[PDB]
Design brief:
This protein is an alpha+beta fold. 32% of the residues lie in helices and 33% in strands. Bound molecules: protoporphyrin IX containing FE. It is classed as transferase.
């Protein structure tokens, strides 16, 4: 089930960016591949993201890995949107890499908001 998929290294730098992720976030694969993953989210998360990763690497206490969470992401044109995020942990060449699977929930949030406003 291809949804948006992103692989980052232990520093948050993007290694691979699926074509579905390009459609969702507005960045091409080439544009994203050397950027920090924090470019896909707004503040306060953006500036705090590196410490989320560092805190996990030092403690081994997952807050989203193996749990899943609904959050707000940011597209290249500046628009934000709700998405579900799941994180997988992997190893390659001795170093940790993390895989993120994203499911866009904009439609769901809208329908729900629509049903609510019509009482
Ligand atoms: C794009 C919107 C995203 C947002 C808003 C977001 C937000 C967060 C938040 C809020 C935390 C945990 C903070 C906590 O509960 O203390 C976190 C942890 C983490 N995120 Fe992100 N993240 C995003 C995408 C990603 C992606 C795509 C990846 C992997 C490709 C990723 C990799 C990680 C890792 C490895 C951790 C540390 C894990 C642990 O606490 O489980 N994040 N992120």
């Amino acid at each position: 089930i291809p949804d948006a998929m992103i692989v980052i290294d232990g520093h948050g730098i993007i290694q691979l960016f699926s074509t579905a992720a390009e459609r969702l976030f507005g960045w091409s694969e080439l544009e994203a591949i050397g950027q920090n993953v924090n470019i896909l989210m707004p503040e306060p998360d953006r500036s705090r993201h590196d410490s989320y990763i560092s805190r996990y690497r030092t403690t081994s206490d997952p807050h989203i890995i193996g749990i899943g969470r609904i959050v707000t992401g940011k597209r290249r044109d500046g628009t934000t949107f709700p998405m579900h995020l799941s994180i997988g942990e992997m190893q390659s060449g001795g170093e940790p890499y993390f895989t993120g699977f994203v499911r866009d929930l904009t439609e769901h949030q809208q329908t729900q908001a629509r049903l609510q406003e019509l009482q």
